[PDB]
Amino acid sequence: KVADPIEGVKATASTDKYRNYYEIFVNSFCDSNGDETGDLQGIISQLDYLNDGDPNSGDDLGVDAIWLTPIMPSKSYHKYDVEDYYNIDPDFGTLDDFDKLIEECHKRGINVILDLVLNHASSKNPLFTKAVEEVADNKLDGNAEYFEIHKASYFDSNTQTISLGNGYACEANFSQEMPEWNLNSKKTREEFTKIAKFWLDRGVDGFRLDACKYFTNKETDGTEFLKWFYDTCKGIKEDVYMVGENWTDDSDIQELYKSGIDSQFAFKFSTSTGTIISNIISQGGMATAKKIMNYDNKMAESNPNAINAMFLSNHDQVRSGNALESQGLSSQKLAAAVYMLAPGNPFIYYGEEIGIKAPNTTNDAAYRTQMVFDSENLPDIYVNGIGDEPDVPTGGGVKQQLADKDSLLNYYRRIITIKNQNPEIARGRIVGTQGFDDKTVGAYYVEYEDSKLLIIHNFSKNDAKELTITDDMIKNATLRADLIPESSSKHTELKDGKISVPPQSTVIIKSAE
Ligand SMILES: [Ca+2]
Ligand SMILES: [Ca+2]
Ligand SMILES: [Ca+2]
């Protein structure tokens, strides 16, 4: 039997901005009080699954940052329509519950960012209802100055608006319940400063910025607004971290990075139509390595400190398992390795690590089904328009997958441990690809502080590849890690400069020390 190369390699917990993030759709995660709605104490009850605080022992997932979807008061189950920016929705808990969450996450080395919704407010937010009332009395110099309120003629036939009195209306791209803020208003920028300070004063590590695409409009430069907001928050907390949801083309993502924001989600590489899943299906390894290098480096031109944010799917998209599980469990495992071993901060969507699927593609709520911690004791959370009992994931719930050495979950755990053993992976830049005369093999060099690693993926579903590593590639090369999905007891070795890379497997080569 070939020895596991990561045995007796010490792992280290992150203490900086580089993290394996976990996105929690709060209503669907964990109910702690029987009302069929997930809540903050439910999250607290599962923190030892997410990270037990020891990267060298235990059976936790090992994620070291959480992004909570909106948690502030709102009449909806998703809460992107924010009615109060200074409290917790009562169904999720109180500010005391929130403070205990921060405390217990930080004890385990888990950072926390909040979903911050700056493009729009709820139509029932009192700041807005006051504006509606003033505008109906033809008063425009009061609360109307917070919002994107103009005469109706100002708006284009295709821009959704909320009709107000005296011939006015408010921009509202997403919904009649989501009137948009005027991001150039001095009053609005003072208010956003107060909101940010309120949450940063509670130990929040940063924000996920909703709907960044809609920051830009006819009179607003989204990059100027975001630079203003990011710089303001950095004055409050120098090491603040933000990731922007900028659901747009590569050129506009590159442009918004001039704001200085740490990260934007890499939509190009996500979903069944995106680069990673498409190329796993096509066995296009070389193409993938090229695209990851070129994208990460291009974004770093606009922000040299860019932290890319790769992901397979999020709460707005069909679950990645709906495309990958039918291709085989080893394809799901390879997909995890590919997106999580790219530079930056990958985002795991809750339940992805146990293969939750979406029951349909016609209701957003199908992307937000109930988390399954134990398939023998299913949860009871009501999911809008779907129901209150989940399907059993193909591999079982968390408990079952931890016990199966060949599970999807344990492959995610091993990827995280490998990253905790090799800080260059997340923190470096790709300085080149490595060809192995084979379109099926994708390989690249990631380098951080003059330490260079060679990451090699074999995208073949059925064929192993015998590769030769030379001193010109990696001097005094050794096998640093392997990820071999067909069996958790199968490992490889670098012997006489040759290494066999099994199907859909990943190896990491490093110089001897
Ligand atoms: Ca509850
Ligand atoms: Ca552990
Ligand atoms: Ca806007």
Side-chain angles (χ1 to χ4, degrees), residues 22-28 40 43 66-72 77-80 92 113-117 208 315 349-350 368:
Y22 194 76
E23 181 193 349
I24 300 178
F25 192 86
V26 175
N27 201 52
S28 299
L40 299 186
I43 297 170
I66 291 165
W67 153 31
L68 302 172
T69 60
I71 59 176
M72 299 164 197
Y77 80 100
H78 56 79
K79 306 201 184 293
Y80 279 97
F92 290 170
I113 67 177
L114 303 186
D115 215 315
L116 192 62
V117 185
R208 177 268 193 183
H315 63 285
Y349 186 39
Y350 81 95
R368 303 153 186 184

XYZ file of all heavy atoms in Angstrom, residues 22-28 40 43 66-72 77-80 92 113-117 208 315 349-350 368:
286
model
N -18.040 29.625 3.963
C -19.245 28.799 3.999
C -20.440 29.742 3.983
O -20.625 30.517 4.932
C -19.229 27.936 5.260
C -20.212 26.784 5.321
C -20.000 25.606 4.593
C -21.316 26.834 6.161
C -20.880 24.543 4.677
C -22.207 25.764 6.263
C -21.983 24.612 5.524
O -22.858 23.548 5.630
N -21.228 29.689 2.911
C -22.425 30.522 2.796
C -23.621 29.828 3.445
O -24.027 28.749 3.000
C -22.766 30.831 1.333
C -24.006 31.722 1.249
C -24.665 31.873 -0.127
O -24.084 31.447 -1.158
O -25.805 32.422 -0.171
N -24.238 30.486 4.443
C -25.403 29.948 5.145
C -26.654 30.762 4.790
O -26.744 31.941 5.136
C -25.191 29.940 6.668
C -23.985 29.076 7.028
C -26.482 29.476 7.357
C -23.653 29.032 8.542
N -27.620 30.131 4.118
C -28.948 30.722 3.924
C -29.722 30.469 5.226
O -30.167 29.349 5.498
C -29.647 30.141 2.704
C -30.871 30.903 2.305
C -30.774 32.005 1.466
C -32.120 30.539 2.775
C -31.895 32.722 1.126
C -33.255 31.251 2.413
C -33.137 32.345 1.610
N -29.855 31.523 6.044
C -30.124 31.328 7.477
C -31.434 30.577 7.715
O -31.474 29.634 8.526
C -30.088 32.679 8.226
C -30.493 32.467 9.713
C -28.709 33.321 8.155
N -32.500 30.923 6.999
C -33.795 30.308 7.255
C -33.790 28.802 7.040
O -34.635 28.102 7.605
C -34.880 30.897 6.370
C -36.281 30.659 6.936
O -36.556 30.957 8.098
N -37.138 30.120 6.142
N -32.871 28.290 6.229
C -32.890 26.881 5.843
C -31.855 26.025 6.556
O -31.777 24.820 6.281
C -32.678 26.767 4.330
O -33.708 27.424 3.629
N -30.325 31.796 14.511
C -28.925 31.985 14.874
C -28.472 30.974 15.932
O -27.337 30.490 15.877
C -28.684 33.408 15.363
C -28.976 34.537 14.369
C -28.543 35.874 14.954
C -28.279 34.287 13.044
N -27.501 27.903 14.213
C -26.136 27.980 13.694
C -25.129 27.736 14.813
O -24.174 26.958 14.654
C -25.878 29.323 12.981
C -26.803 29.432 11.762
C -24.389 29.414 12.616
C -26.805 30.855 11.095
N -17.690 32.368 7.707
C -19.091 32.209 7.347
C -19.581 33.511 6.741
O -19.237 34.589 7.227
C -19.947 31.842 8.581
C -19.573 30.424 9.027
C -21.400 31.944 8.286
C -20.064 30.098 10.430
N -20.375 33.395 5.683
C -21.164 34.506 5.136
C -22.615 34.150 5.465
O -23.146 33.138 4.990
C -20.876 34.739 3.643
C -22.026 35.356 2.881
C -22.981 36.242 3.365
C -22.395 35.084 1.523
N -23.907 36.500 2.391
C -23.561 35.818 1.247
C -21.828 34.321 0.497
C -24.192 35.754 0.017
C -22.444 34.289 -0.738
C -23.618 34.989 -0.964
N -23.238 34.965 6.323
C -24.666 34.864 6.572
C -25.443 35.666 5.537
O -25.127 36.834 5.314
C -24.998 35.419 7.964
C -24.299 34.775 9.160
C -24.589 35.570 10.452
C -24.700 33.319 9.326
N -26.471 35.065 4.938
C -27.438 35.807 4.130
C -28.177 36.777 5.069
O -27.942 36.782 6.273
C -28.372 34.865 3.377
O -29.115 34.015 4.270
C -27.556 33.960 2.427
N -29.014 37.667 4.538
C -29.529 38.763 5.385
C -30.213 38.273 6.664
O -31.035 37.355 6.636
C -30.519 39.478 4.460
C -29.967 39.262 3.082
C -29.395 37.827 3.128
N -29.893 38.937 7.785
C -30.415 38.559 9.099
C -31.224 39.666 9.768
O -31.652 39.487 10.918
C -29.290 38.110 10.054
C -28.265 39.217 10.264
C -28.652 36.836 9.538
C -27.169 38.891 11.265
N -31.426 40.793 9.111
C -32.112 41.927 9.719
C -33.608 41.859 9.467
O -34.086 41.156 8.564
C -31.520 43.229 9.177
C -30.024 43.356 9.515
S -29.159 44.583 8.554
C -27.416 44.215 8.753
N -38.872 35.530 3.712
C -38.025 34.479 4.272
C -36.551 34.662 3.924
O -35.690 34.140 4.643
C -38.487 33.085 3.807
C -38.050 32.689 2.406
C -36.953 31.853 2.210
C -38.736 33.131 1.295
C -36.562 31.477 0.939
C -38.342 32.768 0.013
C -37.246 31.943 -0.154
O -36.855 31.581 -1.432
N -36.237 35.397 2.846
C -34.859 35.615 2.421
C -34.262 36.902 2.965
O -33.050 36.990 3.139
C -34.798 35.622 0.885
C -35.702 36.624 0.251
N -35.391 37.969 0.180
C -36.913 36.484 -0.342
C -36.382 38.612 -0.406
N -37.312 37.739 -0.745
N -35.097 37.923 3.180
C -34.786 39.143 3.926
C -33.852 40.099 3.182
O -33.241 40.988 3.816
C -34.257 38.808 5.327
C -35.253 37.881 6.077
C -35.117 37.874 7.612
C -36.100 36.851 8.230
N -37.544 37.210 8.074
N -33.808 40.005 1.842
C -33.075 40.983 1.035
C -33.792 42.330 0.989
O -33.160 43.327 0.618
C -32.800 40.422 -0.376
C -31.589 39.489 -0.356
C -31.738 38.112 -0.271
C -30.298 40.003 -0.343
C -30.618 37.275 -0.202
C -29.170 39.176 -0.267
C -29.347 37.813 -0.198
O -28.251 36.994 -0.097
N -35.012 35.050 13.719
C -33.643 34.551 13.751
C -32.997 34.697 15.125
O -32.078 33.937 15.454
C -32.772 35.268 12.705
C -33.102 34.917 11.264
C -32.533 35.661 10.221
C -33.952 33.870 10.938
C -32.816 35.353 8.924
C -34.228 33.567 9.628
C -33.646 34.303 8.614
N -18.915 37.389 8.044
C -19.330 38.561 7.276
C -20.840 38.541 7.094
O -21.481 37.486 6.997
C -18.606 38.673 5.908
C -18.998 37.544 4.933
C -17.118 38.758 6.133
C -18.358 37.673 3.541
N -21.416 39.751 7.043
C -22.845 39.925 6.888
C -23.201 40.366 5.476
O -22.435 41.071 4.807
C -23.396 40.979 7.860
C -23.145 40.728 9.345
C -23.892 41.775 10.162
C -23.522 39.316 9.778
N -24.394 39.968 5.050
C -24.941 40.369 3.761
C -25.418 41.807 3.896
O -26.377 42.080 4.637
C -26.086 39.455 3.349
C -26.142 39.225 1.852
O -26.014 40.213 1.096
O -26.290 38.050 1.423
N -24.769 42.736 3.199
C -25.093 44.151 3.356
C -25.720 44.636 2.061
O -25.079 44.580 0.997
C -23.854 44.956 3.717
C -24.104 46.404 4.183
C -24.935 46.426 5.440
C -22.760 47.092 4.423
N -26.967 45.121 2.159
C -27.829 45.433 1.037
C -27.906 46.954 0.898
O -28.722 47.608 1.563
C -29.233 44.801 1.202
C -30.101 45.020 -0.014
C -29.122 43.285 1.475
N -20.473 40.896 2.715
C -20.802 40.512 1.350
C -21.734 41.596 0.810
O -22.804 41.831 1.385
C -21.458 39.134 1.300
C -21.893 38.687 -0.105
C -23.332 39.057 -0.423
N -23.818 38.361 -1.613
C -25.017 38.539 -2.147
N -25.872 39.414 -1.612
N -25.377 37.838 -3.207
N -27.019 30.682 -3.660
C -28.444 30.628 -3.356
C -29.325 31.147 -4.482
O -30.562 31.103 -4.373
C -28.730 31.438 -2.087
C -28.420 32.899 -2.240
N -27.131 33.380 -2.241
C -29.226 33.968 -2.457
C -27.155 34.693 -2.416
N -28.412 35.074 -2.553
N -21.251 26.535 -0.640
C -22.660 26.798 -0.348
C -23.155 25.698 0.594
O -22.937 24.509 0.322
C -23.456 26.848 -1.652
C -24.913 27.263 -1.501
C -25.300 28.263 -0.600
C -25.899 26.662 -2.257
C -26.628 28.618 -0.448
C -27.238 27.018 -2.118
C -27.589 28.004 -1.203
O -28.889 28.346 -1.032
N -23.770 26.090 1.723
C -24.167 25.108 2.750
C -24.885 23.929 2.097
O -25.779 24.104 1.265
C -25.084 25.740 3.843
C -26.516 25.820 3.390
C -27.433 24.831 3.706
C -26.946 26.865 2.552
C -28.728 24.865 3.228
C -28.235 26.899 2.064
C -29.133 25.907 2.398
O -30.418 25.938 1.885
N -32.595 26.467 -1.941
C -32.449 26.840 -0.539
C -33.123 25.812 0.353
O -33.797 26.155 1.327
C -33.033 28.237 -0.308
C -32.373 29.297 -1.211
C -33.287 30.482 -1.503
N -32.683 31.391 -2.482
C -33.213 32.546 -2.878
N -34.364 32.975 -2.384
N -32.581 33.282 -3.779
